[PDB]
């Protein structure tokens, strides 16, 4: 009855501990971007300008 | 204030059915006005009433197609007859999830307003019924009309999803006592199967047109050729919706026709399990073929072969159904009232439409006949004749019940004959022109095809006369000063009825059931 | 209210019902064959 | 019983459809036009005589619809 | 737990051992020779459906609007249906 | 080859493909007229011999055996019979054993076509390219058709193989000439191949079968099949 | 005097995508021009093939892209 | 009323109609075959002059 | 076994209050008076007016 | 009372929330068009319609909770019917995301000649499928385990630890949406890029939106469980939340595998 609750409690605690460790790993990375690719025809297309036109959202 | 509460607020599946019927009638009249305008433009070669502006003609064909394929048959088969006669017939109180019922119905009219405003904005949506991507692109339209139409499709789709969830949960849960699944009538069964198709297929259309929307405005490249993303992707998605879409406009018709034949032949439906399994198989095999609408675009040979085979296999079960109906008239004691007239016309004209469909199902024949008025004749017989004639049959058969009055008989037969003659004259020359080779969706034709299009144009006005007669019938019914009797009609007077819905009252009281029915269920 | 009525509609009761239903159906037809024509009329009223 | 009424109403419906057609596409109570190719009344004439020998850009005049019209040249 | 109204009545019945609508399943042996094939009804007259059948035969379904004063026999399989009110016999809508 | 007033059925054929199409449609129509007449006959005899004045007793039969399986099986063999020829037509039309002799790109612009018989030029820039405009109403001679006559038609040698690469430049289109029995879609990204082989001289007309923008049905296609010597003279003169 | 011949029927592409046929022929011709350069015979063969196959607009756009250094694919 | 007799007569009428249509189709096929046969090996040409 | 952070008799009092009124479902309580007659009502009125103005402007091609 | 009603099903009473929600949807759609194309009333109309839909949805769920918790109209049968309806809704959402996956696959199995006939398109710096996306998968996996822990809290009669498990799950879901936001901001390619970027961003955005709605569902269930509205025998809201969250996790698993693993290969 309660053994199942204890067991899933244990594995959820394990999950959050491992996830917090992995978050510590992923952060502190500088993430330096590489050079912009050459302007291939299929990149940065503007069929109809955005309402906030000049640059896309999230930039 | 009490009446506005009872209408705008009430759940009451019967009242929602009445509202659905009124909306269906309005949408049907609008669609027929568009059809008459199309016919007026196509009456003679040259510019007839549009005086140019073929863009407006394309807008007209798009609006006619949407209006009658989304706002006339679906609000009348599912919302109209479904809402009313699923819980009454199955032997249940008010439907499950009444608020979903109300929200679906009140979602529909804003969808109608969106569609008309899409036909009314800066220039219009001249992209056809099946909005194809590159034409509906922002380079070629740049209006917003296509955006409004796409949102109209979103609202209609969401409403139909809500209705489908309603019907599925009601049939699976809200049945009466003792009533095994194999004792629910075929109307309930067809509504179940069509609700499953509406639940499964329709979200794919929502995804496809959402993708089209974000291709137009938010500047993606799903259907822009430069960057991958061919328009074939949209063809695939829209038609994976499209064919389940067309085996939904006719399944409630099948259910209603089965009921009408059963009640007029003095005997129930021959081969009940055959009917049920054939209809389930039609539902299942409505999915496994979706590209038989795009044979002439460049698929490889093996896909063409497979879709040919799939269309033939989907042809078989409809044959089982029609032969079953023919069998369940071998008994006797027929009686040729107007519902029987319309059921018989349904069977005959749907047979003609189905055979033409078979002719179209092959590959090479579709290579020769793609996008020519042969296809228009095929689906106008099938869809118009089948769905609309089943609709009229159901309407007479059950206006015996909704309002409590009864139509005059000579006017009912006059309307049947007028409509049959007109709408069967006006669509057979479409077969002949399609064989000749005229392309579909054109405002002007070469001089050679002018011979028949004068004759077909003579067919629309007869159908207009028929519809006006039908509305005279509806008004004289709603003001007929002579209620339901035995001399008038012999249905509701039955002390014993195969279907549960005839032995209740003239209209159902308010809950349709002071106390639920039972079943003896012997072998104690 | 008529939740506890023998008939959900009880259509007979209203005031002669005839003019009302006639106007109802005629206005339904008018809305069905007015807007489709009006859309074309407006489009030609435009450019 | 009513076959008189039904048949009479069908014929009346045909009459009304004819009248509406005549007013809307023969005299055009709603504005419109007619092509120059049909009002000339001699265009079909030349169209048929040209099915006999249809002009061409590179080569002598050549026939069209050879089978369904049974029109074609002989030994030469 | 917490409950009041319809769920409370349901759970009180399922705790006391009684079935609320056990009158809604007749489940009787076929026919009437000296014993009527009986149903139960909370009102004066009620809808009853016969599928018929000793256990092998059956007819699809027939709905008849059974009433109190008059026993009704199934049209096709010809068995009696005698009603016996277990509530206040009144017109279902009063 | 051209459309006819008050015509029933297909136009005339100038391609083995179109012969196959005619034969397949005729076989299908034979089987389906059999089906339709039989169904109409059985329905009529059922309605008429039991018309409430001969048989006022329902006769009450609901379960049927050894006839349901019969109308489940017999339509199956009917479908097998009407799918034997279709598959043969498909798998005998796909194969191109012979090499194509020419190559005629047909780029479907917005409301007018274009063509390039590019396989005659020593350079990279293409010679022999032109546009196929519909002739307006007042620019016609006393004979030609309406909205179906074209300036500077497609020229093709007769009795020798072809290969036309349909494609588009603006929106969806379709190259569709019925007399040759050729219909395919020009999608702005792909290059569809059609292998055809005319059998006789003369001119063949066709139209667009897809919704392009506004001048749809005013975007026609004309193909001439002429003798090989004359085709050579015309190409050498056009270069 | 005229040639009256064109690209052959390639075993690799029995479908209806001479779009792939176009791209393949273009890549083979430029692989010539890169590696051999003086295999003028075989590479004129490849050149004639893609000229016959690829539409003029595609050829011009791809040549300009190749000059600009933004030509996707090999 | 005899069910087998009705189905037999229906099949027979269907076959008769199909035979009529097939005779039509055969005559049309013969016309096409003889036209092309001559067009290769006969007086018939297609260019008028 | 522990009741969740409430005495659970406040819920019983609320049940008594709700079952002890003679109105529809959406009007029960004093909160719902304000809520379900003023907020949706004025909100729908404003929505209707803005929808009408927007359709008018889009159709006529004014006020870009 | 049931003995007079003679059947245990539910009969609701009229409420204007259907029509009000439909009017809100019309407001949202016309505002959406008027903001997609530059117009004066666009942004304000879209926002007003969106908050209208939110408000009607709020009062609707409030009404359902009011009925079923205080009036007690839910009997066993309508309790079952609610589960039926929600399973059907999940099936519909499955088909929707199937359509999106079909779009991706049809665009990525045979890449066109115009992106080099290769995948991914040259010049799109694919995310390493192991730094952030792996952490997101681990976070959602732990969230699913925590939801199961909450379910076994409710079932086992221990009605106090249920709020602890639910709050742990909400924290994990918030961490996931925060890391997805970080991924969007640090993206080395935008939506207006090739079909790769386009399908990536559309699919991932709808998945994140489903994550937001599932998270808020879980928040509602957490507040209800804290207030005591749920019991061991009679709880459907929590079961709906658990099924929806399992749906979101499964969709994320398919998404991660296909897009992040295969597309980057
Ligand atoms: C619901 C389906 C439906 C119906 C009923 C109709 C009805 C009619 N249609 Fe329509 N049509 C389509 C669906 C339908 N159509 C579709 C999908 C297309 C494709 C568009 C395109 O390709 O892009 C099309 C296209 C189409 C075209 C080609 C447009 C083009 O090529 O440019 C034409 C040409 O005349 C045409 C004509 C007609 C005519 C004369 C009728 C007449 O039959 C008018 C109908 C007559 C009736 C008898 C029905 C009215 C009934 C009532 C109003 C009563 C309702 C009762 C209640 C609900 C109680 N239709
Ligand atoms: C309204 C519903 C409906 C129905 C029921 C059908 C029925 C069928 N349709 Fe139809 N179809 C449409 C809707 C519908 N269609 C629409 C809307 C279009 C136009 C789409 C567009 O605008 O592009 C179209 C067009 C269309 C096309 C061409 C699309 C294009 O190329 O233009 C094709 C070809 O594949 C096709 C196939 C079939 C087949 C095989 C059937 C079969 O299921 C028919 C089955 C019926 C029977 C065959 C009759 C009963 C059978 C017998 C009595 C037994 C004897 C028969 C045999 C021997 C098997 N349909
Ligand atoms: C929930 C279900 C009910 C919702 C009702 C919402 C109504 C919203 C208001 C609609 C509106 O203002 O439309 C204006 C628009 C105005 O159209 P318009 O912009 O062409 O106005 C014409 C203006 N003059 C006269 C100057 C040329 O109305 C319509 O489009 C009419 C639609 C009628 C539909 C009938 C069904
Ligand atoms: C797909 C999207 C639409 C929402 C789907 C929601 C599914 C919910 C499943 C379900 O069963 O919900 C039940 C609940 C109503 O329950 P009820 O019928 O009142 O039952 C009474 C019993 N006590 O259902 C509800 O309360 C549903 C409320 C939905 C409100 C939606 C408002 C917006 C509508 C869509 C606009 C789209 C615009 C796009 C641009
Ligand atoms: C029966 C109902 C019939 C309704 C008729 C309404 C006519 C309204 C009207 O006047 O429409 C204006 C216009 C007619 O064309 P107009 O510009 O007047 O050209 C005359 C110049 N020679 O109208 C048009 O150009 C388009 C509309 C033509 C009439 C359509 C009638 C449809 C009836 C469907 C039923
Ligand atoms: C079935 C659904 C509707 C299908 C309509 C198809 C119409 C059609 O195909 O018409 C064209 C057909 C042939 O046209 P035709 O001019 O002869 O030649 C054209 C090239 N072969 O021309 C015709 O179909 C015209 C009629 C030809 C004769 C057909 C006879 C069939 C019925 C025989 C009944 C026998 C007695 C039964 C009792
Ligand atoms: C449901 C009941 C709805 C009742 C109200 C409907 C009309 C709404 C309304 O008044 O919309 C306003 C609009 C005029 O736009 P307005 O903002 O006044 O003009 C600005 C110019 N400076 O009004 C109009 O454009 C009126 C257009 C005539 C038709 C009105 C009804 C259309 C919708 C029917 C559904
Ligand atoms: C889901 C949609 C939710 C919409 C919520 C309401 C949005 C109203 C408009 C708000 C707005 O203009 O936000 C500006 C924002 C871009 O902000 P930005 O200037 O780039 O940031 C500064 C950083 N240097 O840009 C945005 O927020 C863009 C929002 C686009 C929404 C488009 C909605 C179309 C219709 C959807 C129907 C569903
Ligand atoms: C149902 C109808 C839904 C209509 C949706 C319309 C389209 C909404 C998104 C439009 C595209 C957009 O603005 O994308 C922005 C962003 C993608 O990121 P990006 O702009 O590339 O940023 C560069 C580096 N981060 O973010 C995205 O692409 C997010 C994509 C998901 C958007 C979810 C919108 C939900 C709307 C719910 C309506 C319910 C009623
Ligand atoms: C995309 C839209 C998704 C909408 C999903 C709607 C699911 C509705 C599920 C439902 O109707 O659950 C019924 C439940 C009733 O509560 P119940 O469990 O019966 O309580 C027993 C107390 N003794 O109802 C409840 O407990 C209320 C649950 C409310 C959930 C609201 C979710 C809002 C999401 C907003 C997204 C924007
Ligand atoms: N009113 C417009 C101004 C910019 C467009 C006209 N120059 C915005 O919105
Ligand atoms: Cu289909
Ligand atoms: Mg096509
Ligand atoms: Zn019995």
Numbering used by the authors:
A (entry chain f): 37 to 95
B (entry chain a): 1 to 524
C (entry chain j): 47 to 93
D (entry chain d): 1 to 76
E (entry chain e): 52 to 145
F (entry chain b): 12 to 250
G (entry chain g): 107 to 180
H (entry chain h): 14 to 62
The article reads:
Complex III (CIII2), also called the cytochrome bc1 complex or ubiquinol-cytochrome c oxidoreductase, is an obligate dimer that transfers electrons from ubiquinol in the IMM (reduced by CI, CII, or alternative NADH dehydrogenases) to soluble cytochrome c in the intermembrane space (IMS). Complex IV (CIV), also called cytochrome c oxidase, transfers electrons from cyt c to molecular oxygen, reducing it to water. In the IMM, respiratory complexes can be found as separate entities or as higher-order assemblies known as supercomplexes.
Nonetheless, focused refinements around CIV resulted in an improved reconstruction with a nominal resolution of 3.8 Å for CIV, which allowed for atomic model building. At this resolution, all prosthetic groups (heme a, heme a3, dinuclear copper A and copper B at the binuclear center), as well as a Mg2+ ion and a Zn2+ ion were visible and modelled into the structure. The residues that coordinate the prosthetic groups, including the covalent bond between Cε-Tyr247 and the Nε-His243 that coordinates copper B in VrCOX1, are clearly visible and hence conserved in V. radiata. Additionally, density consistent with cardiolipin, phosphatidylethanolamines and phosphatidylcholines was seen and modelled into the CIV map. Our structure shows that VrCIV is composed of 10 subunits (three conserved, mitochondrially encoded subunits and seven accessory subunits). Our structure confirms the identity of plant COX-X2 as the homolog of mammalian COX4 (ScCox5), COX-X3 of mammalian COX7c (ScCox8) and COX-X4 of mammalian COX7a (ScCox7). A significant difference is seen in VrCOX4, which is missing a ~100 amino-acid N-terminal helical domain compared to its homologs (ScCox5, BtCOX4). Sequence and structural analyses show that all protonatable residues of the D and K channels of yeast and mammals are conserved in VrCOX1.
